[PDB]
Amino acid sequence: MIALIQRVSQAKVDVKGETIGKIGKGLLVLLGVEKEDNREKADKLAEKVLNYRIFSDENDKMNLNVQQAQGELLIVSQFTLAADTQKGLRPSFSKGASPALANELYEYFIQKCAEKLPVSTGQFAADMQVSLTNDGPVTFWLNV
Amino acid sequence: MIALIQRVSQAKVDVKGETIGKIGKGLLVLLGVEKEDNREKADKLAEKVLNYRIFSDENDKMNLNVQQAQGELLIVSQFTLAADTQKGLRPSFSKGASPALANELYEYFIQKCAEKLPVSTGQFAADMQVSLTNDGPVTFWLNV
């Protein structure tokens, strides 16, 4: 499972011209579900995202996690993170989870993160226009 | 070398409240320079980014590259892509290129991409607020 995170000052997800989810300071979490993922990997990835040292403390050191920083997570399903992009010019998805498993673990990861922090979401399998301001920018590819 | 690309309808880079680079349809390219990178890897990564099948054709199939799609690239230096994030909760940068090499290959990659397409940029080693609308969203981690 992959959580590609971007530190943001604000972000939102629009579907067909309407905003369906938004956050202020926090992380935009693009979530990629792979074959072999399970609730256990989700629990571990949620913990990693929630506690990753990505925010500035009162001295500008990247020392705080999103909880300490009083932020939110905007969680959006992104099947392309699981792509293999090594050869050629077209992505391959052999490691991608089926839509059923991906939606399940996506909604589950959301639940697990919500245990500790306010989170908002996109919509699974909907065309989304995801707007954000990556502050830094700061971007980390986390995975389990 | 890493090019984390996001398909956008628009994007911009602000530095201290002023927009220093912006694009319309295209790709926001977060660029991570690693130790061992060189002009040759840059040439290969620029080609990959420029020709990757990431845009929709007249039928909604992900068949066009950014050149065919008449887009631009917004290239922004991002040292965090080269981080190791496997253990613990704090990133490590053993594979990160020195600021000197990273700035060199960053400006070089920009030159190579400009040979084929209009490109705009952020500023190396400046705190940047990078705003964008990821259309899809569509996100690929490309590397060489």
Per DSSP, what are the bridge partners of residue A133? Answer: A10, B131
**DSSP classification of residue A24:** S
- Phi and psi, residue B28, nearest 5°: -90, 120
Three-state SS at A107: helix
**Beta-strand pair A72-77/B72-77:** unpaired
Report whether the peptide linkage leading into residue B137 is cis, meaning its omega lies within 30 degrees of zero. yes
Instruction: Compute the distance between CA of residue B22 and CA of residue B30 in angstroms, rounded to an integer.
Output: 14
Three-state SS at A59: coil
B52 inside 8 A of chain A by CB: yes
Q: How far is CA A143 from CA A4, A30, A47, A59, B21, in A?
A: 8, 11, 11, 28, 31
Rounded (to 5) percent helix, strand, coil in chain B: 25, 40, 35
Distance from chain centroid for Cα A13: 13
Instruction: Compute the distance between CA of residue A29 and CA of residue A3 in angstroms, rounded to an integer.
Output: 6
- Residue A120, CB half-sphere, CA atoms under 13 Å: how many? 19
CA angle A87, A90, A95 (to 5 degrees): 75
The C-alpha of B141 sits at a distance from chain A's nearest C-alpha, in angstroms, of 7
The C-alpha of A74 sits at a distance from chain B's nearest C-alpha, in angstroms, of 13
The C-alpha of A20 sits at a distance from chain B's nearest C-alpha, in angstroms, of 14
A4 inside 8 A of chain B by CB: yes
**Tokens (6 digits) for A133:** 């301001």
Do residues A26 and A72 make contact, with C-beta atoms less than 8 angstroms apart? yes
Amino acid at A7: R
Instruction: Return left, alpha or beta for B140; rule: phi > 0 is left, psi -120 to 50 is alpha, else beta.
Output: beta
Instruction: Compute the distance between CA of residue B69 and CA of residue B55 in angstroms, rounded to an integer.
Output: 7
Active site residue A121: no
User: Domain spanning B1-144 has what CATH number?
Assistant: 3.50.80.10
Do residues A21 and A137 make contact, with C-beta atoms less than 8 angstroms apart? no
Best A19, A85, A87, A124 residue to mutate vs chain B (most B CBs within 10 Å): A85
Contact criterion met (CB < 8 Å) for B132 and A131: yes
**Tokens (6 digits) for A107:** 């909604």
Residue of B nearest to A47 (CA): B89
Using a CB-CB distance cutoff of 8 angstroms, which residues of chain B are in contact with residue A131? 131-134
The C-alpha of A88 sits at a distance from chain B's nearest C-alpha, in angstroms, of 8
Name the nearest CA neighbour of A38 among A112, A92, A91, A141.
A112
- Phi and psi, residue A33, nearest 5°: -100, 130
In the block, residue with structure tokens 């938004």: A22
A138 inside 8 A of chain B by CB: yes
Spell out the SS3 assignment of B73-121: EEEEECHHHHCECCCCCCCECCCECCHHHHHHHHHHHHHHHHCCCCEEE
Dihedral sign from CA coordinates of B65, B71, B77, B79: negative
* Other CB atoms within 10 Å distance of the CB of residue A52: 23
Name the nearest CA neighbour of B51 among B32, B33, B27, B75.
B27
Using a CB-CB distance cutoff of 8 angstroms, which residues of chain B are in contact with residue A130? 133-137
Dihedral sign from CA coordinates of A129, A133, A137, A138: negative
Contact criterion met (CB < 8 Å) for A133 and B131: yes
Amino acid at A29: V
* Other CB atoms within 10 Å distance of the CB of residue B18: 7
CA angle B138, A17, A30 (to 5 degrees): 30
Amino acid at A52: Y
Name the nearest CA neighbour of A105 among A44, A39, A28.
A39
Contact criterion met (CB < 8 Å) for B132 and A132: yes
**In chain B, residues 89-128 whose CB comes closer than 8 Å to chain A:** 89-91, 127-128
Strand spans (E) along A1-144: 2-15, 18-23, 26-32, 55-56, 62-64, 72-77, 119-121, 128-143
